[PDB]
Symmetry: D2
Subunit: 141 residues, 4 copies
């Protein structure tokens, strides 16, 4: 099915100068960018975005990191997008990504498990929530 998923380019990848290369990859893989913007999470908004993981040990570190500098979000649309985008980004741990998926976003631009370049929706339920969290319908063009 044609699906929409949310990616967020994280501050580590922003700082490395990888934004354009990352967007280029998803464009060349055939996804339509339906929304795109640079913004800065406040710590409160980062915590709301990541609500489902609020009880995890790493949560405060994640919130701080994702509000530590500007990020860029995009809505990607295409066939099987949620799973296909997860394949393109690679394993959570950027070092594992380098071993098993060398051309994945995280292999190319990630550092480790925390600074791993990019977020993507992990499921249709999270995609629905995450897209609405960042973009209104008025912003989808």
């Amino acid at each position: 099915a044609v699906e929409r998923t949310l990616i967020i380019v994280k501050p580590d990848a922003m700082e490395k100068g990888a934004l354009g290369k990352i967007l280029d990859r998803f464009i060349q893989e055939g996804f339509q960018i339906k929304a795109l913007k640079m913004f800065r999470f406040t710590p409160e908004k980062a915590g709301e975005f990541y609500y489902v993981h609020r009880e995890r040990p790493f949560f405060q570190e994640l919130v701080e990191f994702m509000s530590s500098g500007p990020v860029v979000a995009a809505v990607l649309e295409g066939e099987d997008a949620i799973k296909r985008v997860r394949e393109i980004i690679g394993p959570t741990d950027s070092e594992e990504a380098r071993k098993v998926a060398p051309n994945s976003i995280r292999a190319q631009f990630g550092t480790d498990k925390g600074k791993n370049a990019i977020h993507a929706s992990d499921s249709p339920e999270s995609a629905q929530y995450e897209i609405c969290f960042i973009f209104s319908g008025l912003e989808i063009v």
Copy 2:
């Protein structure tokens, strides 16, 4: 239950100068305004907002009217908000509203069935869709 609903002040009420009086009413009724903005629907975006009614005879007239001038949307939060807000706005037909609910928004500021001052979400399912259509999570404060 505490709920969120979407209202939109329509161009007829905007033109009458009723915006402030309408917002004042919902504030005094005890609703929290969680998001608020003036914007202009393009005809395409109005048609998407009203997707569920696309097959109704009045649809093109509605789309045109709701894209004919700027509107103001607000997210209202409170106990039983969806139904309570519908009570405050009154019957669809502003003339009927004057007969049965004289202090309702539509009695006070509506003209007829089409120019009836204000839209409100009609159900929890529509509220979910409508709020996301107009406001991202980043805009709810």
Copy 3:
């Protein structure tokens, strides 16, 4: 000359429930609302908005107050708007406003000099800066 000015309803007036009454007043005085939204200043953005006053003794208190809860900004357009809006809001000190301008916004909804309900651009130069700080051209409708 027809001018545009920026008002911001401050958190004290928001909390008092005065938003609708304040907007109603400017509408009835004949101003066109060209842009309107609820948002929350981060402390950094409040400090940038108030850049010209950064060296004043009250600056940190002002920044904190204006980022302490959501605010609503509006662009008002009309003949001589910058000065006329300043007249409508009244003296900086809400207590003085009650003595000399009883129907002014600050007399009606202000508390003292700091919690004084509303900000308005003080000059054409500040209006130009302030309007752009809060609203893009795309948001003026």
Copy 4:
């Protein structure tokens, strides 16, 4: 001097799939992206953006083209940005760009004089206007 300029990636370059490659170039040239978003000009907003050129013979064609599909704007910051960005994009006519500046944005991704991939502010005065037209201060991060 450190300056800010506005670029807009036009619908021809969007359709060619060049967005990421174009952003990558400006990042690698050392510009800071201070704001970024995808949006769609209405014809009215395109005409306002291009107000200074409203009397030119090509104006309606330009307005139509720039409102014919989504575009992406970015604010670029760096030393001598306005002139340096103009150098990077190359001559107005993409065919001339291919002859004299083969690695310029317009040589790489432009088609002709009208479909020439990208807009950039032509002066500090236009940059000031254009940046405010598309982005508020709240959107610069």
